[PDB]
Amino acid sequence: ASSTPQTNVDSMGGGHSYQFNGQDLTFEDLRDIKDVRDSGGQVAQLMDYKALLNFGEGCEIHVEGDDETKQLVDGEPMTLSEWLEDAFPHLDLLVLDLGGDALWYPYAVGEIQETITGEFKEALPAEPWTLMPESDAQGKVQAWHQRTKTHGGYQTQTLPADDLWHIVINKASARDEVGISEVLRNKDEIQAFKQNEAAINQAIELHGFPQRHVKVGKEDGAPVRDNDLRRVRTIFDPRTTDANTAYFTGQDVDVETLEAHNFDYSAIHEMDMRNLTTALGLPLEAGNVGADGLGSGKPAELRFALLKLAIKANQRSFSVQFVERVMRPVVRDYSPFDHEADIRLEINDPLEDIGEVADLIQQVGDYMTNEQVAEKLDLPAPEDDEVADSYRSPADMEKDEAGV
Amino acid sequence: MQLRRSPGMRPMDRDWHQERARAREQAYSSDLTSQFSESEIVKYELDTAQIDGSDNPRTYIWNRTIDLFGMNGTDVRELRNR
Amino acid sequence: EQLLEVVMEGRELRKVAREASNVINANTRVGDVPIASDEEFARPTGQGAEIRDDGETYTTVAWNATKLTEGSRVTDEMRDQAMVDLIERNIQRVGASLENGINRVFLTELVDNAQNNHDTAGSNQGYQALNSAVGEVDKDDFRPDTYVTHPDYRTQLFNDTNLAYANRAGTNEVLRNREDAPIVGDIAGLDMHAAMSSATYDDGTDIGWSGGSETWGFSSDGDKGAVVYDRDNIHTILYAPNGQDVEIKDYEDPIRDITGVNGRLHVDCQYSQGRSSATVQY
Amino acid sequence: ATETQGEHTFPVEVLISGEELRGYTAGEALSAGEPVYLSGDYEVSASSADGGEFLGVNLYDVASGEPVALAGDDCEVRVEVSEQVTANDEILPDGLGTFETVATSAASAGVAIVQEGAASGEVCEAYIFAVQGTTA
Amino acid sequence: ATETQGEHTFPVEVLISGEELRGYTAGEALSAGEPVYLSGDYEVSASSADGGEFLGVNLYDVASGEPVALAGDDCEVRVEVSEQVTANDEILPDGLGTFETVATSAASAGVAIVQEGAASGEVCEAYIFAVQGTTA
Ligand SMILES: [K+]
Ligand SMILES: [K+]
Ligand SMILES: [Mg+2]
Ligand SMILES: [Mg+2]
Ligand SMILES: [Mg+2]
Ligand SMILES: [Mg+2]
Ligand SMILES: [Mg+2]
Ligand SMILES: [Mg+2]
Ligand SMILES: [Mg+2]
Ligand SMILES: [Mg+2]
Ligand SMILES: [Mg+2]
């Protein structure tokens, strides 16, 4: 075969010029994503729920054959997992920030940082709306172009791709190194939602409340002028009126009502929410809306299967890129360990029923090692390797050892 | 100070684009006074729009009063040789 | 499908004053730079005679920064219905207008108050004019390090065989990359070039501006087309009440559906030593 | 009133400064920068050639009967002048959609004062300081 | 212009009320409270006597060529009068950096109305209601 790709990629063109495509977006489009994110309301809350489902449950670092890595780091032994957990103390927060950004924006992006001594400090995120990638003829990122607010306008620079890192969740193809914003992808549905919310709010003000219409004069009678109506407005002024006011009139005064003109804003709101939630891939229930026949049985099981599959796909896509483009470089450059080790970062499932896992262990624990049980149950494995490796319970062995 | 109707501002207005495009699609000729309101001609600056009936789809779609062959609704600019 | 979500830019002027001069971030809108008297020669005297005084005398160059401003006001009906972000566009325009303002203040001081002149009288307008203008400054015992240049002067200079021929320049960079060539910023002992725009100098034709004394250009008898000077001896003094630098503020009207953006900066520009500078004349 | 930049013609923004924007019915078709006067109840029309017909300048092009924004007095405006003008000249509606000087007109008082001078057919900058009506 | 409290002299605040503060280049050195008029493109100079020369009052001391803030139409101001004035007197520039009454001048119309009376050589409080330019 060959040592470089020989199929072309669509991902080359006249830069951030006046053409339109998902990888060709401008700094204005990036700030448009930022404006949707900033401005709050229902749309922001749904996309935050999406970030929390994908990344909010926290994380765990594994190394295949971790114990074999055991080495003196600073006069004391560590394994590579112990070193990584010390290199990234607050990884649960970092994963939520980057995982959030990579759902909103086309990419999460950032820097490695060192101490003055040159020991590793942190992986430091960068504000994704400020940065855009520049790519070669085969679609790989060569440089990062940044512009940012500064005294009296914008300040601009270029950075080499060799010392930033970036992560992409949403892609046009497996070949796409630049990715897609789900905000810009679904911008029509977001605009439609916001327009109908404004339309409902305005319609409630005009039509949701009754209004008094006093008509003055006889039909085909003497005309009443504006100054004449002023003296009538004074008698019926709603600011001066109170609940049990009574009225006395001649025959030629009529106190009519503009009724509240019924319209089903609830059904319109439900329709907007159903459009938006499905556009963002969330279940309808995330929008505080429900439907008949979807609450239980196989209809419930399927929508929750689809949600958990969507989460697993995002989680793996993020996990692989974070290990390959943040953790391995950090191990290679700042660590006594082998960077070619089988590191995994796994992100917790947000929708695990611990009570179901416990009942599973009651049924088939007789076929699981104590370490496999501890893993499913989300606890540390036993301190004794034979206890960890054995199948029958640690308490069931402990009560038998107590028989000696 | 610039209002949305102010002359230097018209090209910024989404509606000025939309209504000029929509005017071109509605017209049968360049004769604006016949086809449009004095308000539209001023507000959307229709003198400056290339209105002539060439962008109206009904210019090209056949719509004969008697059609025994289902020919109506064919658009001549969609044929093999256009 | 949706219409083109785009705007095509206008002409953008060259902005160099912050790099091409010593910038002072002043603490006050008015102030003084203190200046020492020139060096002298120790006088001959007989034995046992009193040594007479001729101590260091001082003066100042006053700065008196003027508030440059630019503003814009738009209705919220327009702002909401716009093709692009109108407030981002007006921010960019306001910022640009104030940078252009600094460059006008700088260039007008630089051209008018330079104390030396080399008159080319047509003739040898390329490298020989730059070398001659360095000579004029050197003859007042200062040494220049920078030059500021008109588009007409640049065009003449890059036609000069001493730059346009690789044999004579010692590199083909001027022929290839014109203004971006490293030799253009490293010529006649000058270690910086500051390419100006034509409109920058104050003709007095612009509204609110009253003109300088010279004509800036290099295409008719008597135009000043370049200035060769010491960058440390020309000061751009910037003052801002609320920071180091240009402030943009978002106005919103208390009553009307009106929003706006207004920029400001205070700038002055003053020679410390006007003898450290020479204009080149057509 | 137009500015030229290369190929392009740009309309000048009429209103430089001030907040005396006020709304009237157009008595006829009017174009941006025209001086206007009261011609009926809240209705404005293009000013005639001497005194007694000025309320403000129209800010945008209108068909007959449409609502008009005026810049009134207490505003600075960009306006086309039909003759050469200089700073301190008082100016007056010209009858031609332009302004002209009081000195040229049959009148003895202006509605705006020239702040920046201009040649015949150029755009002046001026401050509107008065209205004029029927005194008989 | 000055007020006295005990042994101290304080400068008066030239502006009492109003938002009509506008910017010009000074065509000469000017002192706070002087009446000024247009003498070139956006350039102001001290008003001479007998009318045709008033845009507003200078608000702070300036050297020649400096930018000057100026108060005009709709402003309410503290200004030094050349002669005794009373409430409801119309006043206009005196040619001496002060104001004087229309009644005293050769002119027939003022630029400000006295709201609080004053003796000669001291500050009245006045409201600026008009500007005067070259009518010929
Ligand atoms: K006439
Ligand atoms: K007198
Ligand atoms: Mg009757
Ligand atoms: Mg001082
Ligand atoms: Mg002695
Ligand atoms: Mg001496
Ligand atoms: Mg000399
Ligand atoms: Mg090149
Ligand atoms: Mg004002
Ligand atoms: Mg007031
Ligand atoms: Mg007023």
Is C67 an interface residue toward E (CB < 8 Å)?
Answer: yes
Is B21 an interface residue toward C (CB < 8 Å)?
Answer: yes
CA of C32, nearest ligand number? 4
Query: Residue D136 has which token pair?
Result: 């008989």
Cα(B30)–Cα(B59) distance, rounded to whole angstroms?
A: 13
Cα(A102)–Cα(A99) distance, rounded to whole angstroms?
A: 5
Cα(D15)–Cα(D7) distance, rounded to whole angstroms?
A: 25
Q: For chain B, how long is the longest CA-to-CA vector?
A: 62
C136 phi/psi in degrees, rounded to 5: -60, -40
Q: For chain E, how long is the longest CA-to-CA vector?
A: 50
Are the beta carbons of A91 and A59 closer than 8 angstroms?
yes
CB < 8 Å to D63, chain B: 37-39, 41-43
Q: Do chains A and D touch (3 or more CB pairs under 8 A)?
A: no
Q: List, in order, residues 6 or more apart from C119 with CB less than 8 Å away.
A: C281
Is C10 an interface residue toward D (CB < 8 Å)?
Answer: yes
Please give the C-alpha separations between residue C150 and each of C75, C76, C282, D6, in angstroms, as whole numbers. Answer: 40, 42, 12, 20
Within chain C, strands assigned E span 22-25, 30-36, 58-64, 66-75, 116-119, 146-149, 192-195, 224-229, 234-239, 247-252, 258-271, 277-281
| D110–E55 C-beta distance less than 8 A | no
For an interface test with E, give the residue of D75, D81, D88 to mutate (most E CBs within 10 A). D88
Q: How far is the CA of C117 from the centre of ligand 7 (A)?
A: 8
3-state secondary structure C209-246: CCCCCCCECCCCCCCEEEEEECHHHEEEEEECCCCCCC
The partner residue sitting opposite A153, judged by closest CB among C5, C6, C95, is: C95
Beta bridge partners of A370: none
Cα(C10)–Cα(A65) distance, rounded to whole angstroms?
A: 63
3-state secondary structure of C69: strand
Cα(A38)–Cα(A228) distance, rounded to whole angstroms?
A: 52
Instruction: Residue D12: name the closest of D134, D135, D117, D122 by CA.
Output: D122
Provide the resolution (angstroms).
2.7
CB < 8 Å to B9, chain C: 74, 78
Beta bridge partners of A328: none
Please give the C-alpha separations between residue E124 and each of A310, E78, E128, in angstroms, as whole numbers. Answer: 80, 6, 12
- For A327, which DSSP code? I
Residue of B nearest to C73 (CA): B1
Cα(E14)–Cα(E80) distance, rounded to whole angstroms?
A: 10
Please give the C-alpha separations between residue E107 and each of A307, E52, E91, in angstroms, as whole numbers. Answer: 87, 9, 10
C71 phi/psi in degrees, rounded to 5: -145, 165
Query: Residue D6 has which token pair?
Result: 């290369």
The amino acid sitting at C97 is S
Are the beta carbons of D96 and D82 closer than 8 angstroms?
yes
CB < 8 Å to E74, chain D: 74
Cα(A124)–Cα(A141) distance, rounded to whole angstroms?
A: 19
The amino acid sitting at C266 is H
Residue E43 buriedness (CB in 10 A; 0-12 / 13-18 / 19+)? buried
Tokens 């972000």 locate to C85
Are the beta carbons of B71 and B59 closer than 8 angstroms?
no
CA of C28, nearest ligand number? 4
| CA distance, residue D6 to nearest chain E CA (Å) | 26
CB < 8 Å to C72, chain B: 2
Cα(D106)–Cα(D127) distance, rounded to whole angstroms?
A: 21
Q: Does E74 appear as a known binding residue?
A: yes
Cα(E33)–Cα(E13) distance, rounded to whole angstroms?
A: 9
Beta bridge partners of A34: none
| D5–C10 C-beta distance less than 8 A | yes
The partner residue sitting opposite B5, judged by closest CB among D19, D29, D60, is: D60
- For B9, which DSSP code? G
Cα(C221)–Cα(C122) distance, rounded to whole angstroms?
A: 8
| B1–D63 C-beta distance less than 8 A | no
| C207–E66 C-beta distance less than 8 A | no
Are the beta carbons of E114 and E80 closer than 8 angstroms?
no
Is B17 an interface residue toward C (CB < 8 Å)?
Answer: yes
For the beta carbon of residue A217, count every other beta carbon within 10 angstroms: 15
Are the beta carbons of A46 and A69 closer than 8 angstroms?
no
Beta bridge partners of B19: none
Q: List, in order, residues 6 or more apart from A101 with CB less than 8 Å away.
A: A107, A108, A109, A125, A128
Four-point Cα dihedral C213, E47, E19, E117, nearest 10 = 160
* Helical packing angle, A41-55 and A265-279, nearest 10°: 40
Residue of B nearest to C259 (CA): B1
Where b means 16+ CB within 10 Å and e means fewer, C197-213 reads bebbbbbeeeebbeebe
Please give the C-alpha separations between residue E73 and each of A304, C98, E124, in angstroms, as whole numbers. Answer: 72, 29, 17
**Would the CA dihedral through A42, A47, A53, A59 be positive or negative?**
negative
State the number of CA atoms in the 13 A half-sphere of B6 facing the CB.
Answer: 27
Are the beta carbons of C277 and C229 closer than 8 angstroms?
yes
Is A248 an interface residue toward C (CB < 8 Å)?
Answer: no
Tokens 């290990």 locate to A323
Cα(A280)–Cα(A288) distance, rounded to whole angstroms?
A: 15
Is B77 an interface residue toward C (CB < 8 Å)?
Answer: no
Cα(A289)–Cα(A268) distance, rounded to whole angstroms?
A: 12
The amino acid sitting at B25 is E
For the beta carbon of residue D22, count every other beta carbon within 10 angstroms: 12
| B2–C75 C-beta distance less than 8 A | yes
Tokens 């109170």 locate to A242
Give the residue before each break in chain A, using a C-to-N cut-off of over 2.5 angstroms; say none if it is continuous. none
State the number of CA atoms in the 13 A half-sphere of A339 facing the CB.
Answer: 13
Cα(D49)–Cα(D37) distance, rounded to whole angstroms?
A: 12
From edge to edge, which strands make up the β-sheet containing E15-17?
A: E15-17, E76-80, E123-128, E112-116, E90-93, E99-101
| CA distance, residue C76 to nearest chain B CA (Å) | 9
Q: List, in order, residues 6 or more apart from D5 with CB less than 8 Å away.
A: C10, C11
| E43–C207 C-beta distance less than 8 A | no
| B3–C81 C-beta distance less than 8 A | no
Q: Does E50 appear as a known binding residue?
A: no
Size of chain E, expressed as the number of residues it contains: 136
Is D62 an interface residue toward B (CB < 8 Å)?
Answer: yes
CB < 8 Å to C1, chain B: none
A388 phi/psi in degrees, rounded to 5: -60, -45
- For C39, which DSSP code? P
3-state secondary structure of A233: helix
Where b means 16+ CB within 10 Å and e means fewer, A11-39 reads beeeeeeeeeebbbbbbebbbbbbebbee
Please give the C-alpha separations between residue E127 and each of C39, C88, E19, E79, E87, in angstroms, as whole numbers. Answer: 59, 40, 13, 10, 11
CB < 8 Å to D125, chain C: 207
For an interface test with C, give the residue of A16, A28, A35, A188 to mutate (most C CBs within 10 A). A28
* Helical packing angle, A41-55 and A187-207, nearest 10°: 140
Query: Residue A103 has which token pair?
Result: 């759902």
E98-106 contacts at long range (C-beta below 8 A, 24 or more positions apart): E99/E35, E99/E124, E99/E126, E100/E49, E105/E49, E105/E50, E105/E51, E106/E49, E106/E50, E106/E51
Where b means 16+ CB within 10 Å and e means fewer, A60-72 reads ebebeebeebeee
Is B12 an interface residue toward C (CB < 8 Å)?
Answer: yes
Angle at E124 between CA E123 and CA E127, to 5 degrees: 130
| C10–D125 C-beta distance less than 8 A | no
Angle at A347 between CA A345 and CA A351, to 5 degrees: 160
Instruction: Residue C198: name the closest of C135, C149, C164 by CA.
Output: C149
Q: How far is the CA of C52 from the centre of ligand 7 (A)?
A: 30
| CA distance, residue B2 to nearest chain D CA (Å) | 7
Neighbours of chain B (3+ CB pairs under 8 A): C, D
| CA distance, residue D29 to nearest chain E CA (Å) | 31
**Would the CA dihedral through B25, B27, B31, B37 be positive or negative?**
negative
Q: Does D19 appear as a known binding residue?
A: yes
Q: Do chains B and A touch (3 or more CB pairs under 8 A)?
A: no
Cα(A318)–Cα(A345) distance, rounded to whole angstroms?
A: 9
| CA distance, residue D5 to nearest chain B CA (Å) | 14
3-state secondary structure of A357: helix
| CA distance, residue C208 to nearest chain E CA (Å) | 6
Instruction: Residue C265: name the closest of C242, C281, C282 by CA.
Output: C242
- For chain C, the C-alpha Rg in angstroms (whole number) is 23
The amino acid sitting at E118 is A
Please give the C-alpha separations between residue A142 and each of A135, A138, A173, B73, C27, in angstroms, as whole numbers. Answer: 5, 11, 19, 52, 43
- DSSP conformation letters of A193-212: HHHHHHHHHHHHHHHSS-EE
| CA distance, residue A130 to nearest chain C CA (Å) | 15
For an interface test with C, give the residue of B3, B4, B55 to mutate (most C CBs within 10 A). B4
